Amino acid sequence: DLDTHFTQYKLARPYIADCPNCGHSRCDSPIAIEEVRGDAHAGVIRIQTSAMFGLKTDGVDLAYMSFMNGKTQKSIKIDNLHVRTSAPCSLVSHHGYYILAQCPPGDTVTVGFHDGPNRHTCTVAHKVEFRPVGREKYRHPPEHGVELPCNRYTHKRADQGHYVEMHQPGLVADHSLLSIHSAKVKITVPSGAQVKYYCKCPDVRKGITSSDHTTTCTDVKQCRAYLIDNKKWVYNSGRLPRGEGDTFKGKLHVPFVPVKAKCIATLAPEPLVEHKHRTLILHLHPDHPTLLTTRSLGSDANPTRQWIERPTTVN
């Protein structure tokens, strides 16, 4: 069932963190790229974001995602969610904070999704590359060849013993809930949000309220506000401020853990052998850079090793 995998992820919520090159001027993005993993053997990468995929407030669904604008969590159907590095990658799966994709090599990682006329893009620099399997340096997995042992990120969202922790969110500063009532500033607290305040208009008047609390000073610029929401936890990123007290550790499983399976490698064309007195001549005609290693079966091996890129003849 879906509830087994989405058990602890229902207790969590998205967040807004710092993203460099979100548009052109490094805004605060609803989806923020953290900790790209790209060390498989088929060019398949795993991207962890700050949004939530495969989750809706009402119920779990694989065609609905959850994100945050302001302080309100919004749910939008996944319509155009794209990952591109230098060409548009074909994403495989998504589960909570994580996206799995199959990307061509390049120097950047980009994600984006629309809801209405918005764009919501984040780009984080990261050098991904294609890692072939075997002794031939191909640039794409072939139609046919020889099976070789390879390790790749599986597309199953099971537990598999790997965990990450989630924490209570830190105070979040909202400036939209401070307004002037008639000539004094007023605090609007939505649904028991317990807004903290800090005024230094003639002096310090720090304190915690839960309802109304019209502050007795003039300007909105000389007072700050916060918000302690404790309903849903968040993953402790490095782009979020920590809490005040001691914070418990959660246990959120990493869905797409690395496994070891099978990979397809290219087979080189057969060389043409010519026999001479104590001499072996190989006419090699390769299409990819190929490795040729020889040795002798005597007391000294005398090993040779060279990468063949052009059609050469070796004696």
Partner: protein
């Protein structure tokens, strides 16, 4: 291959903060003063030009260490054994390792 994990940094709005020596591999801790951070929805707080950001970090092994890793061995000379195939007279081939 390692993986470095960064916890959430603490932000003291106007004051000072210190950190202890936690037992961790390659643990690092610092204090940066006077940052004035800018989150979403305005600045974080009011106490101008003196603050404190901790931003600790420590390293750990990665989740790919269980799949591919290099094993370090020290050798010492041991046994040599072989498998022989033998026959004699009118008796057919029988094999056993020696």
């Amino acid at each position: 291959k390692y993986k470095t994990k960064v916890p959430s940094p603490v932000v003291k709005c106007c004051g000072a903060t210190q950190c202890t020596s936690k037992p961790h591999p390659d643990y690092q801790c610092q204090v940066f003063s006077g940052v004035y951070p800018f989150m979403w929805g305005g600045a974080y707080c009011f106490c101008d030009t003196e603050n404190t950001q901790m931003s600790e970090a420590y390293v750990e092994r990665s989740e790919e260490c269980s799949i591919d890793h290099a094993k370090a061995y020290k050798v010492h000379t041991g046994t040599v054994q072989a498998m022989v195939n033998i026959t004699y007279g009118s008796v057919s081939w029988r094999s056993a390792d020696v």
